[PDB]
Amino acid sequence: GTHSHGLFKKLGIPGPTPLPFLGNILSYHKGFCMFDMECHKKYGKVWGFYDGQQPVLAITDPDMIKTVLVKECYSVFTNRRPFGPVGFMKSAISIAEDEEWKRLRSLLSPTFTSGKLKEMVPIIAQYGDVLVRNLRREAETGKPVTLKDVFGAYSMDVITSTSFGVNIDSLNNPQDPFVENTKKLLRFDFLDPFFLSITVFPFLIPILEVLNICVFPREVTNFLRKSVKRMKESRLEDRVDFLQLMIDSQNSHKALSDLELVAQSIIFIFAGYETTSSVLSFIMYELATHPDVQQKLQEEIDAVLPNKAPPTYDTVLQMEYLDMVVNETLRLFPIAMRLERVCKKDVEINGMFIPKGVVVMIPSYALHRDPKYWTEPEKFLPERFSKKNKDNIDPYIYTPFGSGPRNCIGMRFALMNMKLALIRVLQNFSFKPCKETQIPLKLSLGGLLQPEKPVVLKVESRD
């Protein structure tokens, strides 16, 4: 339980001294973000710690971050950390490694071009209209609104239609079989008891795989696998969704196997579902607690889109203050918290030796709130991202979507999705705090960047 706990000592790298077997995981009692902030503050630009026996090297120099995420991505820093028993989802692009990831990224990148996105915009926009209709119910009864619920439904609606052409008002069909399955693809809490145990007993992962025990719910993955087979078999006899693009990609490296395709369909839900709804909720919390910013944003929207004109791909990209609001919220709440890459081979990068097998970690949350780069980092200040000020932002300090060849493949889609939701909602409503609104917002101490209590807000119709 100590074998590798001498590594950073031998390399002269500072960090919290690890306990046998556990390493440093007891320092996670306040979650990832507080641990990373405290280590940054007390150890400086680089430090190392141990998740069980696994050494993790944290780096904060932007030039070093570029070398890892960009310059040496294919040669040395290709893969993320393996995390638990995964079964056939081994073929999902975010979990695949080395040449197999490189292949999958090539097969799937044409699916995320601006041209495919623009062709999807009318689809996503339809569910913004559904969102507004549902919000209007509660704006009329005066009941406070739980944001994760309404933005969760929106997120689900956009996924099911843009992924499979499945058109559902999920907020009002919460027991449609397709919705009750996809709702279960939530983000993993890596500080929960199962994942803590796997970190201390990583040698048990092969035992779980041989028993077909999978961190992705078996019932959900099998429902989706058989649903997809049915859509594929259909369709053929008699759409601009991700499934159709992937189906088309199967007829011209060696094509995308049928199982590989279902794995991507599932991982796209997992990657986009709770991420989008969380960020939307943080944004509306910031707008509700900064009425001046909400008004300025509604003024911009009304100017670009007079008389509640429906948003379009081009009109969205025109809105600079909208972009500034989205960007500043993601500075405060980079829901990934950390970026990680395994070091595949002994390397020396910009001054320091990094041994094979170390996980190199970029603490996005901590860098996003680092006073060296950000004046008053705890304040919500969209003007940081104005054309005036934004040139002073280092792209390797601000990394809410990662960076380089393995960054977020759905970044453009997620930005466009969230902005289209925000536009439609703000055209129709203003959001204000309740007495049940938690002000200021407290973050959870678990493994997910989420509010301590669900955000709840009053919705008032601008009509």
- Residues in touch with ligand HEM (CB under 6 A): 69, 93-94, 105, 267-268, 271-272, 275-276, 279, 335-336, 339, 400-403, 406-410, 413-414
Residues in contact with a copy of itself, shown as a per-residue x/- string from 322 to 361 under the rule CB under 8 A: -----------------------x----------------
- Are residues 170 and 160 in contact, defined by beta-carbon separation less than 8 angstroms? yes
Name the amino acid, one letter, at 439.
I
> At how many degrees (to 10) do helices 147-164 and 411-428 cross?
130
Judged by CB under 8 A, the residue of 210, 236, 238, 251 near a copy of itself is: 210
Q: Binding of a copy of itself at residue 6 (CB under 8 A)?
A: no
Both structure tokens of 442? 């407290």
Q: Which stretch binds a copy of itself (CB under 8 A): 55-63, 207-215, 259-267, 450-458?
A: 207-215
Distance CA 145, CA 334 (A): 24
Judged by CB under 8 A, the residue of 209, 258, 340, 370 near a copy of itself is: 209
Q: Which ranges constitute the DSSP H helices of 256-410?
A: 258-289, 291-304, 313-318, 320-332, 364-368
Distance CA 211, CA 125 (A): 43
Least Å distance, CB 242 to ligand HEM, is 7
Q: Binding of a copy of itself at residue 255 (CB under 8 A)?
A: no
Q: Binding of a copy of itself at residue 207 (CB under 8 A)?
A: yes
- Are residues 339 and 364 in contact, defined by beta-carbon separation less than 8 angstroms? yes
Distance CA 391, CA 398 (A): 12
Give the Å distances, CA to CA, from 288 to 131, 193, 294, 429.
18, 35, 7, 11
Q: Which is nearer to ligand HEM, 4 or 126 (CB)?
A: 126
Distance CA 371, CA 334 (A): 16
Q: Which is nearer to a copy of itself, 97 or 169 (CB)?
A: 97
Least Å distance, CB 26 to ligand HEM, is 26
Q: Binding of a copy of itself at residue 206 (CB under 8 A)?
A: yes
- Are residues 240 and 116 in contact, defined by beta-carbon separation less than 8 angstroms? yes
Least Å distance, CB 341 to ligand HEM, is 7
Near a copy of itself in 81-120, by CB under 8 A: 99
Least Å distance, CB 209 to a copy of itself, is 8
Choosing among ligand HEM, a copy of itself, none, which partner's interface includes residue 245 (Cβ < 5 to 8 Å by kind)? none
Least Å distance, CB 94 to a copy of itself, is 20
Least Å distance, CB 139 to ligand HEM, is 25
Strand partners, 146: 456
Q: Residue 443 has what DSSP assignment?
A: B
Gaps in the chain (C to N over 2.5 angstroms) fall after 238, 252
Least Å distance, CB 344 to ligand HEM, is 15
Q: Is 33 part of any known ligand binding site?
A: no
- Residue whose entry in the numeric block shows the structure tokens 């689809």: 123
Q: Which is nearer to ligand HEM, 139 or 339 (CB)?
A: 339
Choosing among ligand HEM, a copy of itself, none, which partner's interface includes residue 271 (Cβ < 5 to 8 Å by kind)? ligand HEM
Choosing among a copy of itself, ligand HEM, none, which partner's interface includes residue 304 (Cβ < 5 to 8 Å by kind)? none
Q: Binding of a copy of itself at residue 218 (CB under 8 A)?
A: no
C-alpha distance across the termini of the chain, in Å = 64
Distance CA 108, CA 410 (A): 10
Instruction: Give the annotated binding-site residues.
Output: 408
Instruction: Give the annotated binding-site residues for heme.
Output: 408
